[PDB]
Structures are given as structure tokens and as C-alpha cells.
Amino acid sequence: LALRAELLATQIREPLNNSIGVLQSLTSIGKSAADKEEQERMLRSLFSVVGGVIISGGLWPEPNRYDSLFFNKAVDQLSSWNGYDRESWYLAAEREAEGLYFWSPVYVDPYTRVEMITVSTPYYRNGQFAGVATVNLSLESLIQFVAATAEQYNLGVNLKDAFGVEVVSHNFDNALVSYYSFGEFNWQIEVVNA
């Protein structure tokens, strides 16, 4: 249960760290001093990754009016938002040190209509704040992945955000439990044998 929970956290940190990887690619594109055209070309490619936990995401430059490059995977570039400058995820990252990542709570996107978590980071150009990159992670994609991984280790699992919020619950009585906090983000798993 101990080592088995450690190997589960390892296998669950893969899509999360790869969410950071994509987000770092978004930041580089925002810092690239690129015209909107080429940017659309590259952002469609980056999201063209097959499957995964990411459902949508894009770039959100400082207003002044609005020029957000948002994309969703159903890939179709979205139109609305153009404001996003007053959105929780936007503000948490506005004019923050480049390289910091902010995980939002679980919420329902009004536009795309998906239960998700929004990780946000700022990108800079010429030592000036330029915008915010975001990556939206589908809760259903994260749930099926964690459920299939734990069940393959013959375990029940309860993963929680740093918010201590029940993100997923799978097969979780006199029983032993293992609490494993992992990652720069303060997520934890509660694991039993199933």
C-alpha cells in the first residue's frame, strides 16, 4: 500500500507534468515576438497532441482591444472572450514572476461547458508583462486515467487538490490507508487496497 501508493503518484504525475510542459510551450510562443498568423499555426499544432488530459487552452494578452487565441479540442479556435482580464485564473498570474504556475479550483467553464482546472502562468516581452497563458484540464479525462491506473494497481484512491477538494474517488470498513503528498503542488492521494 505504501510502495503501491508511491508508484501510483508517480504514474499520476505524468499528465500533470505534461500539462506544465505544454504550458511552458505556450509561454514560449507568447514570448516569441510572433505575428498572430504564425502563432495560430503553432498553437493548433501544440494542441493537436493526441488524447491527453488537456481539453483547451490558449493565450490571453493584456487588453488594449481584446486579442485572445483560444483553442478547444472536440480543434476549433474559439471566438468569445474578445473581458478575460477579470477572470480568476487571469488575475492569479497577472504580473507574477515568469515560471510560476497557478492551479485553479475545479469549476465549470461557461463557454466550453466542461468541468476543468485552469493552470495559468504569465509570459513577458521586453521586460514587460505581456499576457497569461493557460491550459484547461478536463476532469473527466483526469478521472478515467486515475481510475484505470489505481484499479490496475488493485487500489482505491482519493486524490485532492491543494484545496483538499475531492477531485477523483475510485473504490474508496476496517482498512489501512496511505496518505501521499506529492509535487510542487500540494496534491495528496489516499489509497487503500481494492
Author numbering: 46 to 109, 118 to 127, 132 to 139, 145 to 234, 238 to 259
Anything the authors wrote about it?
The canonical V. cholerae quorum sensing circuit is controlled by four histidine kinases CqsR, CqsS, LuxPQ, and VpsS. CqsR, however, is regulated by ethanolamine, which is produced by V. cholerae and the host. As anticipated based on sequence analysis, our structural studies confirmed that CqsRp is a double Cache domain, which is the most common extracellular ligand-binding domain in bacterial receptors, including, among others, histidine kinases, methyl-accepting chemotaxis proteins, phosphatases, cyclases, and phosphodiesterases. In V. cholerae, ethanolamine binding to the periplasmic domain of the receptor CqsR controls quorum sensing and infection site selectivity in the host.
Because purified CqsRp contains ethanolamine derived from the E. coli overexpression host, to obtain an apo, i.e., ligand-free, structure, we generated CqsRp-D198N. Based on the CqsRp-ethanolamine structure described above, we hypothesized that substituting Asp198 for Asn would disrupt Asp198 hydrogen bonding with ethanolamine without disrupting protein folding. LC-MS/MS analysis of CqsRp-D198N showed that it contains less than 2.1 ± 0.2 μM ethanolamine in a 103.3 μM sample of protein, and we then determined the X-ray crystal structure of apo CqsRp-D198N to 2.50 Å resolution. Since substituting negatively charged Asp198 for uncharged Asn resulted in a dramatic reduction in CqsRp-ethanolamine binding affinity as determined by LC-MS/MS and the absence of ethanolamine in the crystal structure, we conclude that the Asp198 negative charge is critical for ethanolamine coordination. Importantly, ethanolamine, L-alaninol, and serinol did not bind CqsRp-D198N. In addition, while the CqsRp-D198N crystallographic asymmetric unit was dimeric, the protomers were anti-parallel, which is inconsistent with a biological arrangement. Analytical size-exclusion chromatography of CqsRp-ethanolamine and apo CqsRp-D198N showed that they are monomeric in solution. In contrast, CqsR-D198N was completely irresponsive to ethanolamine. The interactions mediated by the platform residue are essential, as substitution with Asn resulted in the loss of in vitro binding and signal detection in V. cholerae. Ethanolamine binding to the membrane distal Cache domain triggers its compaction, and the residues corresponding to helices α3 and α4 become ordered.
